Structure 1
Amino acid sequence: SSQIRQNYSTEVEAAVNRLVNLYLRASYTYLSLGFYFDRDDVALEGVCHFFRELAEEKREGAERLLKMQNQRGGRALFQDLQKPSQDEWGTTLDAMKAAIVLEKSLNQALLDLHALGSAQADPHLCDFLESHFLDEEVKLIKKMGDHLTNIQRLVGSQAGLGEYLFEHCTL
């Protein structure tokens, strides 16, 4: 509230609420991804667990943003959460590509908020994004790109399968 609020624009407050919505939508997407891979007719438990852990990470991201909104004296406002873009997610390849697209969209929202913070001369906001969000997204996206390459290699060819097994079983 107005008792503590200092150098915290209405533009940033609003964008923070919208980012919270995006992270919770992402978390819901990952919940859907996770339970799809849990289906008896899909049955890739490691993929289910990968996506379910991401759902938790995304929710934790929204919660840190909400805590920050209150620390700055803004008002947390919650919007409807849109259901995920698909009801069935295809193969592991299709799923990881959708995951990367999703993370890139969050990453772009983080950068757009960083840009707003910079235009509003709000260094606390930039510091907050730097310390808790930007590097984490870069690391996750790298890990997903890695996974995508390995899925493609494995599902593509027996040269691919061969190189994977040597790396994973011998090295």
Structure 2
Amino acid sequence: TSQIRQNYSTEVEAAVNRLVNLHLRASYTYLSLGFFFDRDDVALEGVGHFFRELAEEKREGAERLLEFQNDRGGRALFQDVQKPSQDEWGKTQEAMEAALAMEKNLNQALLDLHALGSARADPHLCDFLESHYLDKEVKLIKKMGNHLTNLRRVASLGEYLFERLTLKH
């Protein structure tokens, strides 16, 4: 009943609310990962920083979806944000393998929303996802793959040198 709502399906509106929740859950997971690597008994500041920066990127992704929801005349509906899947994240390689799986899951959710937009002929939604999400996800997944290949190469002394010489401080 929004005065502005036009060509905006209830199915897309609900899927947007679910994708907000998925972004907030990813942000929360990266917050957990970020602080884990700053424990005195882990102490990999570059790994901490990498995950803390991703926590902020995923939260910005959620906020952009909420702005889209308001711009199209849908109604934001919030759900609980589930705690992250682990309390302790293991070595850098295991943490980045978990991050890569979570990003591929988020990318699949974005591609599923794009498919719904295409099926409901909502080209504003298609363009929003292509402009702000799909290439960002491809570039981030590629960067995580590159990191995992280098962590496998240096496999520990190798994990220290990866944090010192690849990751930003």
Structure 2 length-normalised TM: 0.92
Q: Report 1:84-123 matches (<5 A).
A: 84-123=84-123
What is residue 74 of structure 1 aligned with on the other side?
Answer: 74
The one-letter amino acid paired with 1:49 is: H
* Separation of aligned partners in 1, 2:83 and 2:133: 24
How far residue 155 of structure 1 moved from its aligned partner, in angstroms, is 1.1
* Separation of aligned partners in 2, 1:157 and 1:16: 44
Give unmatched runs, 5+ long, in structure 1.
Answer: none
* Separation of aligned partners in 2, 1:8 and 1:21: 20
What is residue 6 of structure 1 aligned with on the other side?
Answer: 6
Deviations, residues 35-85 of structure 1 (Å, cap 9, x unaligned): 000000000000000000000000000000000000000000100000000
The one-letter amino acid paired with 2:11 is: E
SS of 2:155's partner is: helix
How far residue 157 of structure 1 moved from its aligned partner, in angstroms, is 10
The one-letter amino acid paired with 2:97 is: K
* Separation of aligned partners in 2, 1:155 and 1:12: 45
What is residue 53 of structure 2 aligned with on the other side?
Answer: 53
What is residue 145 of structure 1 aligned with on the other side?
Answer: 145
Give unmatched runs, 5+ long, in structure 2.
Answer: none
User: Alignment RMSD, CA only?
Assistant: 1.9
Query: Could you say if the C-alpha distance between residues 143 and 82 of structure 1 is closer, same or farther in structure 2, counting changes exceeding 3 Å?
Result: same
Overall identity of the aligned pairs, in %: 81
What is residue 16 of structure 1 aligned with on the other side?
Answer: 16
Deviations, residues 143-167 of structure 1 (Å, cap 9, x unaligned): 0000000001011999xx9xx9xx9
* Separation of aligned partners in 1, 2:154 and 2:116: 42
Structure 1 length-normalised TM: 0.91
* Separation of aligned partners in 2, 1:2 and 1:151: 51
* Separation of aligned partners in 1, 2:124 and 2:90: 42
Moved segments of 4+, more than 4 Å: none
What is residue 33 of structure 2 aligned with on the other side?
Answer: 33
SS of 1:97's partner is: helix
The one-letter amino acid paired with 2:69 is: Q
* Separation of aligned partners in 2, 1:22 and 1:157: 35
* Separation of aligned partners in 2, 1:81 and 1:96: 21
Larger RCO, structures 1/2 (Cα 8 Å, 6+ apart) = 2
* Separation of aligned partners in 2, 1:18 and 1:72: 16
Q: How many residues align?
A: 162
